Design a protein around this ligand. Structure first.
Ligand SMILES: CC(=O)SCCNC(=O)CCNC(=O)[C@H](O)C(C)(C)COP(=O)(O)OP(=O)(O)OC[C@H]1O[C@@H](n2cnc3c(N)ncnc32)[C@H](O)[C@@H]1OP(=O)(O)O
Ligand SMILES: CC(=O)SCCNC(=O)CCNC(=O)[C@H](O)C(C)(C)COP(=O)(O)OP(=O)(O)OC[C@H]1O[C@@H](n2cnc3c(N)ncnc32)[C@H](O)[C@@H]1OP(=O)(O)O
Ligand SMILES: CC(=O)SCCNC(=O)CCNC(=O)[C@H](O)C(C)(C)COP(=O)(O)OP(=O)(O)OC[C@H]1O[C@@H](n2cnc3c(N)ncnc32)[C@H](O)[C@@H]1OP(=O)(O)O
Ligand SMILES: CC(=O)N[C@H]1[C@@H](OP(=O)(O)OP(=O)(O)OC[C@H]2O[C@@H](n3ccc(=O)[nH]c3=O)[C@H](O)[C@@H]2O)O[C@H](CO)[C@@H](O)[C@@H]1O
Ligand SMILES: CC(=O)N[C@H]1[C@@H](OP(=O)(O)OP(=O)(O)OC[C@H]2O[C@@H](n3ccc(=O)[nH]c3=O)[C@H](O)[C@@H]2O)O[C@H](CO)[C@@H](O)[C@@H]1O
Ligand SMILES: CC(=O)N[C@H]1[C@@H](OP(=O)(O)OP(=O)(O)OC[C@H]2O[C@@H](n3ccc(=O)[nH]c3=O)[C@H](O)[C@@H]2O)O[C@H](CO)[C@@H](O)[C@@H]1O
Ligand SMILES: [Mg+2]
Ligand SMILES: [Mg+2]
Lengths: 449, 449, 449
């Protein structure tokens, strides 16, 4: 049936020492609250209600999911008060799932089990048994059935012995929720409005509350400071690394691999230590990635070998390309089949053709380079005049002597050769040798300072 | 006495998602099955029988140990059936040790203890007590003596309570083995031929089976998927790192060090984080290796300092050399005493003499450079004309101005100076200044675009 | 009241395989014994007595704290004998705290608690309960009170059951210490003089011994080999990383962060994996540090972004600078606001002005570069003539064409343009174009080898 989600993110993240709202701090390259929103949508949420207290401008800039209904909670008078701010927007005939904006690892599988356990006209509750339940809501039961929740501060010493605690996540019909929310009072230890009081209220009406537990404790851990965020980051990376290994991707050290986005891949891919994958990356079959590489929003074809310490962003490599070590590909870098880029070579908005090579100490920017081309060490395409950028065109079968400067815009015809140390300011004819050289001379018995 | 080893590697590695046979996947830069073969030979095996089912071409390409006897097992009808395929090759007077091709960490010390425990005319068995013995063969005993093995599938619930399980490794006389192997039947739960049935068969004959245990569980863990391979990789790296530390090598972080081959070393060597050692590497006394370096098949003399992010392969450094950070030495790179290579410098088949320096943005390929030489930033030896490679020779005491292009083949005489920005196409005399410079001129009030 | 500290560092570090005295091996970039000395001074020590046996020259070179009193212990006849060598220097009216030179993580907080527990005329003792107390001094008690210490070798089997052991750290009045030290005998299992015998001696006099425990076992762990040193290094890095996270510094992976010195910082600093901070580093607000960077003795202003694999030492960056990836800043490198240094760029004793850029394959050494300057790829300041270093001056608004060689000493006037491929040997006038170019020519139908 129909279901909407409410995410409470209006608390204050004091122990973060940040000018950025807590729920906006990232985990795996994505805002913590975005992880929660993705979970809600992945579960099938019709609407996602986001309850916030401040940093609204920043939140709105960062969060732009279409089905987001922004709900203000000016004063943080408790989770109960927060839900009251969203309640008017709940549909009487839909389920309402409540989540926290700072509990990023909640899994859709567990939420789905929770939805399934929710009884008609009742409440589905997510609980966990902890060795030390200190500080959390205690689940009370009567003849095995959940009858309420007692907050740590309000709980007696004996009640504090209860180890089954409230994760905070629960689900119930919207009309029922409105009914219970209207009856909340702040006559308790904290002097706030407890969303947890709706459990006793439902039980009193004869409705049943059923509790289900998460697969892992990490799923329901909340983040209040950077150290906690750090730990969840590791858990997330570890689980992703493990899935990749089980899916056939060889990671030389799963503890030294970070994925911050999406990784699409073929068979027999090998990834060495300390590699970082960002944004959306596609890897063909047998791609080998050497240690320390950083690859972002790029496409890498079959059989490519990316040598150590290579940085790649918004690049496209055809099959059998070899780049690095110490290569740097920037947006627009394109390599055709079998192309090669060596050490200390940078490419930006440049295309290197089939079997073409740029082995060293080179800059290729705003260029189109043909097939079977050899770019000597030290070559530079001078694409910028201080105000505009210009294109360099190199036809097939060209041999560029080392330390050549190509002053764009310029075109080098097919089959040409450019002598070492040339400054190319004009088009070069096909099968011609371009040169601008001073004959070597010599001064005898030269004494250095 | 005489002993041969049989390695069963004919099972199918389905959960690997690979086109490469499972036992060929590497651990520490070596095929898993090669680890097992090395163990067999290290223990003293006269012959090593390798039982395979497919990928024979790939296996034969990768494995080339002289004492390997390849045994085919076309249909995988069980470990018992696999041993029957090798049995005809067992000598009646030698011990036969059975190992698995996908259990890479088995230690020679444990195998040696197993050999020693084997009773005359009996069987030495390797067992381990697990908290959860699910899925493994259960060891049955009568008055403390091993009398048989019952496979998980064939075992009753009560028998499944037995926690001592079969690691799979065992040893027995060859003639005895042939005798028992001939009597195997496939009337069991799996409908296969269990090598494990020979335990009961030996006991029935009045022969004794003695069980010994491994030092660590990791020693007998098998690999069926990449995640399991990953874990064993870490265990292996951790133990190697620990031995190195105990041997006097300082690793700044043993969890961030990888050795894939052999490391020979002197005293007081310091290796920072994320260093990777491949093939055969020799390090003299007091060598210091900065973070992220990759060193392969190289020799590094006393007191060298390899700065951060330097890649080295098939290179030879004399004492007191300093290279990096961001230096890249390729095959044939040779540095004599006290030589220096700085950042963004690449060397290939090139020799840099005593106290000689190439501090920046340089390429030295196919060159012989004398002592007390200074190579300025931007210098390039143009060793390739598009079809052939040529040599560059630089005598002692030469000062090469920055951004010099040396067009090989060419020789620079001793004591020469090469002016900055020179293109050297001809030999330079001794103590002479080579130059090819356009005098600097100027155009007044130049307006850029 | 007054207190002095005695550090016993005269034992022999055999299992280190080093030519450097054991206590001089570093942990977090500092000698193990220096960690102990810092603890002593941090606690308020008037004098720090260092008892050594050899390597005195090396120790004296490395250790130079003003309040250090060097005490020789030629023969290592036991901790008791070692203390006797320092005793003559104890003041009758000061407390004497004994520490070990190879127990680097002892915390000042625990030492302070120990000082506070010391009873008038008695002894404060630091003890710990271990699961396996093997090899350590056993604490004996009578009616709950500490009455002595029995060394493992001298202890009976029943006494070896005692799990509360001596960490070795203790404190007592100096006059009392001298009194007890004079009565030590070497009639025991080791045939040495046990400092531990003073416990029974004090108890016999009617003085009381009070025991306090450390916060963590790591605090009192001693180092005898490199593997143990390694573990303490990790503990130290982990605790420092954790404090930084709690202080508001975001570390993408606290297990892959190393701090070897001091880190001062603003708010919202983000540090990616494998970054290493050395010496004294200051980071402004919102500084972002990409993976693998090494930063030493440097200052980094607000909003700077240091891209991957950048090495920085003794550099000063104003606000909003962007450098890397693969940039290398050496001592004296200074960037003014908004400056930019790209890949494969090296700077040494050079200043780059406001909004100035050096994006690629460049060397800037001994230079002063103005604001709004563009340094093209391949540019090199030739600061060295083989004997002397010279300065390069570039005024504001200069555009330097790529692959330009500037032969220092030289000055480029404000607003000038330097053509690509120029060798600049003379001053360039303001708003003028400097050039030294051979016009491009062409040879038809050139056939390569
Ligand atoms: C590390 C790396 O990247 S290696 C890969 C890149 N390789 C390089 O940079 C090396 C490129 N090679 C060169 O620049 C060479 O000097 C070449 C190709 C120009 C010369 O080729 P060579 O076989 O040595 O020819 P060489 O110079 O001796 O031949 C003489 C001819 O050149 C011409 N020549 C020499 N100098 C000049 C000049 N300044 N202007 C015009 N023509 C000249 C002569 O007029 C003569 O003409 P001809 O063929 O009609 O007789
Ligand atoms: C970052 C780093 O790698 S730094 C280390 C590497 N260093 C370098 O690249 C710097 C090298 N230095 C140079 O290239 C210099 O310009 C040098 C060595 C050639 C000039 O040395 P200087 O002391 O400045 O001499 P200067 O040019 O003023 O002397 C004039 C002489 O040069 C000659 N000269 C100048 N230009 C030319 C030319 N195009 N052709 C021939 N001779 C010339 C003059 O004929 C004159 O000859 P003379 O000695 O008989 O009087
Ligand atoms: C990857 C990067 O770093 S990109 C950023 C760095 N950018 C660069 O290195 C590109 C720099 N640009 C150049 O070097 C260009 O060749 C420039 C600026 C010198 C030429 O500018 P252009 O717009 O193409 O002018 P162009 O050469 O066609 O103009 C002709 C003039 O140059 C002069 N000229 C050309 N060659 C020479 C020469 N050898 N000696 C003297 N003057 C010359 C002519 O006399 C003429 O003078 P005029 O203005 O009075 O008519
Ligand atoms: C009364 C109540 O609900 N108690 C539960 C709550 O504790 P408790 O209320 O103490 O927990 P928190 O203060 O951390 O608040 C929980 C979540 O609600 C948000 N928030 C809170 C108050 C507010 O006015 N607005 C708002 O948006 C916070 O930003 C956070 O995401 O979570 C615990 C799990 O962590 C449960 O064991 C407790 O039973
Ligand atoms: C009947 C038998 O022996 N059972 C043992 C076997 O289980 P089990 O037979 O189930 O184990 P596996 O199927 O993994 O086979 C073990 C090894 O034998 C090889 N293989 C197997 C069958 C075949 O026809 N050819 C072949 O080469 C596999 O490649 C693997 O290297 O190992 C377990 C340890 O892991 C033991 O606890 C079991 O008692
Ligand atoms: C007799 C004595 O004191 N026993 C204690 C000592 O053991 P034990 O005496 O066996 O310990 P060590 O030999 O390691 O010596 C402790 C420290 O004293 C130094 N040293 C030792 C002897 C010497 O002549 N000069 C010298 O400087 C060592 O360099 C080391 O820093 O430490 C243990 C904790 O580790 C305690 O549990 C033991 O009760
Ligand atoms: Mg150049
Ligand atoms: Mg040049």
């Amino acid at each position: 049936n129909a279901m909407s989600v409410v995410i409470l993110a209006a608390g204050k993240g004091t122990r973060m020492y940040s000018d950025l709202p807590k729920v906006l701090h990232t985990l795996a390259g994505k805002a913590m609250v975005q992880h929660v929103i993705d979970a809600a949508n992945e579960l099938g949420a019709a609407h996602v209600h986001l309850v916030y207290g401040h940093g609204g401008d920043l939140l709105k800039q960062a969060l732009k999911d279409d089905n987001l209904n922004w709900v203000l909670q000016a004063e943080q008078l408790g989770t109960g008060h927060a839900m009251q701010q969203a309640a008017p927007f709940f549909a009487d005939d839909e389920d309402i799932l409540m989540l926290y904006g700072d509990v990023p690892l909640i899994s859709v599988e567990t939420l789905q089990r929770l939805r399934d356990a929710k009884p008609q006209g009742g409440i589905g509750l997510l609980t966990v048994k902890l060795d030390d339940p200190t500080g959390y809501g205690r689940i009370t039961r009567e003849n095995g059935k959940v009858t309420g929740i007692v907050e740590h501060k309000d709980a007696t010493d004996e009640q504090r012995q209860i180890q089954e605690i409230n994760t905070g996540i629960l689900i119930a019909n919207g009309a029922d929720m409105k009914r219970w929310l209207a009856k909340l009072t702040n006559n308790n230890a904290q002097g706030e409005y407890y969303i947890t009081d709706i459990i006793a209220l439902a039980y009193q009406e004869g409705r049943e509350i059923v509790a289900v537990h998460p697969q892992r404790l990490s799923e329901v851990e909340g983040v209040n400071n950077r150290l906690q965020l750090s730990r969840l980051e590791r858990v997330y990376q570890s689980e992703q690394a493990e899935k990749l290994l089980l899916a056939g991707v060889m990671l030389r050290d799963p503890a030294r691999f970070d994925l911050r986005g999406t990784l699409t891949h073929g068979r027999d891919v090998e990834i060495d230590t300390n590699v970082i994958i960002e944004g959306n990356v596609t890897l063909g079959h047998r791609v080998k990635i050497g240690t320390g590489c950083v690859i972002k929003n790029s496409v890498i074809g079959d059989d490519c070998e990316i040598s150590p310490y290579t940085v790649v962003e918004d690049a496209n490599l055809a099959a059998a390309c070899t780049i690095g070590p110490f290569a740097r590909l920037r947006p627009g870098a394109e390599l055709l089949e079998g192309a090669h880029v060596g050490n200390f070579v940078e490419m930006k908005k440049a295309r290197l053709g089939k079997g073409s090579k740029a082995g060293h100490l080179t800059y290729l920017g705003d260029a189109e380079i043909g097939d079977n081309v050899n770019i000597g060490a030290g070559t530079i395409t001078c694409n910028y005049d201080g105000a505009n950028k210009f294109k360099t065109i190199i036809g097939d079968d060209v041999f560029v002597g080392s330390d050549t400067q190509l002053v764009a815009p310029v075109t080098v015809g097919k089959g040409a050769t450019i002598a070492a140390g040339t400054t190319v300011t004009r088009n070069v004819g096909e099968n011609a040798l371009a040169i601008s050289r001073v004959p070597q001379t010599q001064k005898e018995g030269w004494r250095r300072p």
